[PDB]
Write a protein that binds this ligand. Structure first.
Ligand SMILES: Nc1ncnc2c1ncn2[C@@H]1O[C@H](COP(=O)(O)OP(=O)(O)O)[C@@H](O)[C@H]1O
Ligand SMILES: Nc1ncnc2c1ncn2[C@@H]1O[C@H](COP(=O)(O)OP(=O)(O)O)[C@@H](O)[C@H]1O
Ligand SMILES: [Mg+2]
Ligand SMILES: [Mg+2]
Lengths: 371, 71, 214, 371, 187
């Protein structure tokens, strides 16, 4: 019986069977409930929509996110999503498949303890295991050394790995991801008179960001050219037939990843924070860590982000060093792909957290075994 | 089946109308049968009287109803 | 392998004549009727005029009542849980849509007799019944999947005995693998206004085609 | 057994049995009293005529409407009409038939509380229920998503509904209907020399409107063609044999629906009242509301009113989207038909207002349940 | 207020009558300290009824609508809006600041504008804010009597300052730079 590889991030839930090369369920991680008054008889018995059906009824629903900043905050809703991805999206029996869960580094200790307790007690999974976002990304790249920059929807973190060995002291975590960029774009658009205030409208701004935003190779030059001409303008059509225009906001929303002071944060940019982590490593392994730079996650999908990323690192590192950046076209699903490889490994079949171990040790077994 | 449906009521109305349209033919046949018997009995006069009265009223009603389909 | 394929057809065709005792076979009968009235707008189906659509409205509505009876039996034997609550939610919608089809079709029938066909000469009066038909089918697809989940989840549970559960006569197909990347095309260059992606609505034929007999 | 369905409006009264397809009693909602001296002995005992019999004796009566602008103003005459339709029209005993009533939205609360009190105390019904007229129009249309434009004899209102959920904040009610068009026609007709001042003569003018009035596609262009030629003239014959002629007044009377300033009202036309109602809804459901635009009521029966509305909406809405108008041939009885669907429904049989609940709560029970 | 006034039978539809409703609001409306308690008391007795006289001489009576209209500030769902009330918005803003200044921001809560003149809004805001903040902190609300003209009073103070004359927008500055000068200088 094949294992289950579930990658439940802040924004989307990816699930599938171990050994495959693609997930089978990719739906938003939202739960919506009606906020209006039901008049037609028999149409109001349903009181909770999960996933794709919730997104198709944004007009009469309020959308909540069970996960924010990679930390689960609502547990009743999270159980609903897990039940939805086993019986509806995958249509399998949870009680006869070991399940592989994933978690981000430097999360609260009690977070994964509650994740394991729910899996064994409720879904009766025979076994389970918890992995790390950045570690699984290396498998998808087919390398054993390098530094991983995973930028998702709730958290951005770096993990340097050399010859299959980790350096926990050099791991950096930054709570600035795609969700923060959506809020900034929502506020910036008010300069032209466009206002979105509802939770349903926030999903419209997310669609605009993924279709019109890009990273500028040089920020100052683009600002000078933006005001002089109108060659950087683009138009987007709202669902109600209205058309909006965007000028310099196209390259301003993704640019705050390098200047977090725009949103008010004191943390350094992504280019600087990965440079600090490299110099926190030993001097012998820095020679190759400059190369083998792996980027993963949906936030790393902006056009020209790699070109800007390489230029900034070059200006910091000595001129003798060679700087390379790896950006696969499939990097949105890199975390899940590495999960399938690990779950189907021949030598990995001996550290699944079996149910018998859980009974004699309680939920605290994950800390001493799972990494 | 789940809820009352107009088709069943329509069928009931049609059946009732057909029954009413055949009972008058039965009444006319009964009148014809009791009229043409040369012999007469005491317990037959009242029946036959009520029968012509009912048939004559029914014929008057039919004649009045027929004109309503014109202008 | 030529001889092997014949066994699958025999097992599959064996359920098409179950006399409507199973939930899945009733839903398949439902969908075929709806496609006939859906194709009436294009005028390439068995139906030819408005009176054909009205006759089809009664047949799909009458089959709705039997679907309600079949679904409710499973819910009663199922212990209270999330699956049971979802199952009963759609059964409320089936009663409303089925009742609407009965009354509305009767109204369209009387109007045909009084004012003639020229009153309903335009096809506009036809989509009133067609809209309610596809509304009913969406609830029928949902209650089939909800009924299946409760059957498989509580197959061993007490109270499910002497019942025709889908868990013992049907199997689910594994969902298709998602594409790793959306391939770009050259048509987006011509369009100067970037629009949102159209939502993909599931087709009832495809939602029911994933069922396979044991 | 059978549950009565009574739809009492400003002009007409509709009643019948739930589950049928057409009402069994349609008579005017007027009560007349004699106004002339009676000289023949025994012929003056009757002092009040109700319904059709009052309409046949207009020459010696003063007709009055117990309901104006959708609000019941004479509770003594209203009980007369309710007694007429229960005994002289339907020939039923109210003691064994729950009844369903209708009432327009944004109506005073005291209207339905006193309506319920009469039903339980006077006629002694076992159960009852009060619904919204605009909601019942969607039941009869075989739909669950759309915006309903209901225009009767006293009030015109708009109610948007999406997936069986109402949006109360987007409901617009305008007190302009057929009775106001009749009054304007009498004033307009005086230009040609015709005078109708009696209440009995208002019924003559109402019949003139229903047989000769229409809505022009373009008002300004139609006025030009009215003066140049005499091809738009038609003649009507009064009951006493006199013949009148109507010129441009045929399309001037119904024009006040789109130009309420003719009567002096400051409000906007019905075309941009619906657009304002749509624009007050959520941006995501506006696509399904521009289509599925349902019209109901006897005031919407003028020739060309559907085509005129579509032209006016299309000029206001964005050109990318499509606007549809639904005008069923039987839209004069749409409200009653929806009531028959709701009352006979199986799932509705648990939300009647039983007489037991009225005992322990009084007339206020209707607000918490009927809505 | 115009929408919920039709429940009693009074209808105002024209723009001229919208000014009548505004005057009624400014004289009869107030903020309820506890919304649920006021609802129960309104149904129990008619002690909250007040009368108003229209220009034509008619007299209208208003019951529980006096405190329902200002309640939509704290419960925006009444008018169909989704965002949180003013009591919660002013608390979300505080949490978005750094922790070192939150103590001083919890105090010195200043109100301004005519909308904040409802009788009891100062007390109601304090009750709701304290229920969200930790019990250790203290909450103070400043409600000057002249807060309807606070915006103008500050403006006269700034323009008359002796160190402000160097940041005006001279006409010759606009002549060569155009209207875009207002963005970088004015704030
Ligand atoms: N083409 C794109 N350009 C920019 N941002 C994107 C694009 N596609 C997705 N995103 C953003 O990246 C995020 C993707 O989330 P994902 O990569 O699945 O990680 P997680 O599962 O942790 O949310 C989304 O929140 C979305 O806002
Ligand atoms: N064919 C028609 N053309 C124009 N106006 C009509 C027509 N039929 C009815 N009307 C007007 O519309 C009104 C219809 O009343 P109706 O909708 O049946 O109930 P209510 O009294 O609730 O409005 C009548 O008062 C009449 O003046
Ligand atoms: Mg992720
Ligand atoms: Mg009406």
């Amino acid at each position: 019986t094949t294992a289950l590889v579930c990658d439940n991030g802040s924004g989307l839930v990816k699930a599938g069977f171990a050994g495959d090369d693609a997930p089978r369920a990719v739906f938003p991680s939202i739960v919506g409930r009606p906020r209006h008054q039901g008049v037609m008889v028999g149409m109001g018995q349903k009181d909770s929509y999960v996933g794709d059906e919730a997104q198709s009824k944004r007009g009469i629903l309020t959308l909540k996110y069970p996960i924010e900043h990679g930390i689960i905050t609502n547990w009743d809703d999270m159980e609903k999503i897990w039940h939805h991805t086993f019986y509806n999206e995958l249509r399998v029996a949870p009680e006869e498949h070991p399940t592989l869960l994933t978690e981000a580094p430097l999360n609260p200790k009690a977070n994964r303890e509650k994740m394991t307790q729910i899996m064994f007690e409720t879904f009766n999974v025979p076994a389970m295991y918890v992995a790390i976002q950045a570690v699984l990304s290396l498998y998808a790249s087919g390398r054993t050394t390098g530094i991983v920059l995973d930028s998702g929807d709730g958290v951005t973190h770096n993990v340097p790995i050399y010859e299959g060995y980790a350096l926990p002291h050099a791991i950096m975590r930054l709570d600035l991801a795609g969700r923060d960029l959506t809020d900034y774009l929502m506020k910036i658009l008010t300069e032209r008179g466009y206002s979105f205030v509802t939770t349903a409208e926030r999903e419209i701004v997310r669609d605009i960001k993924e279709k019109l935003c890009y990273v500028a190779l040089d920020f100052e030059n683009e600002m000078a050219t933006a005001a002089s001409s109108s060659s950087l303008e683009k138009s987007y059509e709202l669902p109600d037939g209205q058309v909006i225009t965007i000028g310099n906001e196209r390259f301003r929303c993704p640019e705050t990843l390098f200047q977090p002071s725009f949103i008010g944060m004191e943390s350094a940019g992504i280019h600087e924070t990965t440079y600090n982590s490299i110099m926190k490593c030993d001097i012998d392994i820095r020679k190759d860590l400059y190369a083998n730079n792996v980027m993963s996650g949906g936030t790393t999908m902006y056009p020209g982000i790699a070109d800007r990323m390489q230029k900034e690192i070059t200006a910091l590192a000595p001129s003798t060093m060679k700087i390379k950046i790896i950006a696969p076209p499939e990097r949105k699903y890199s975390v899940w792909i590495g999960g399938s490889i690990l779950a189907s490994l021949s030598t990995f079949q001996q550290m699944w957290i079996t149910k018998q171990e859980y009974d004699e040790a309680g939920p605290s077994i994950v800390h001493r075994k799972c990494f | 089946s789940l809820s009352p449906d107009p088709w069943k009521r329509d069928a009931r109305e049609k059946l009732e109308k057909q029954q009413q349209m055949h009972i008058v033919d039965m009444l006319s046949k009964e009148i014809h049968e009791l009229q043409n018997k040369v012999d007469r009995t005491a317990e037959e006069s009242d029946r036959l009287r009520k029968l012509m009265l009912e048939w004559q009223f029914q014929k008057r009603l039919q004649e009045s109803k027929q004109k309503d389909e014109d202008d | 392998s030529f001889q092997e394929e014949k066994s699958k057809l025999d097992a599959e065709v064996s359920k098409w004549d179950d006399s409507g005792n199973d939930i899945i076979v009733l839903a398949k009968q439902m969908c075929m009727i709806m496609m006939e009235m859906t194709d009436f707008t294009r005028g390439k189906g068995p139906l030819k005029n408005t009176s054909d659509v009205i006759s089809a409205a009664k047949k799909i509505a009458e089959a709705g009542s039997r679907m309600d009876k079949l679904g409710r039996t499973i819910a009663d034997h199922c212990p209270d849980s999330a699956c049971k609550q979802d199952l009963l939610a759609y059964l409320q919608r089936i009663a409303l849509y089925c009742h609407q089809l009965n009354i509305c079709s009767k109204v369209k029938a009387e109007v045909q007799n009084l004012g003639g066909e020229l009153v309903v000469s335009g096809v506009d009066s036809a989509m009133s019944l067609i809209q309610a038909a596809k509304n009913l089918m969406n609830a029928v697809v949902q209650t089939v999947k909800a009924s299946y989940v409760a059957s498989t989840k509580y197959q061993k549970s007490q109270g499910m005995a002497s019942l025709n559960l889908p868990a013992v006569s049907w199997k689910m197909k594994a969902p298709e693998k998602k594409p790793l990347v959306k391939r770009e095309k050259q048509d987006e260059t011509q369009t100067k206004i970037k629009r949102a992606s159209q939502k993909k609505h599931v087709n009832p034929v495809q939602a029911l085609s994933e069922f396979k007999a044991m």
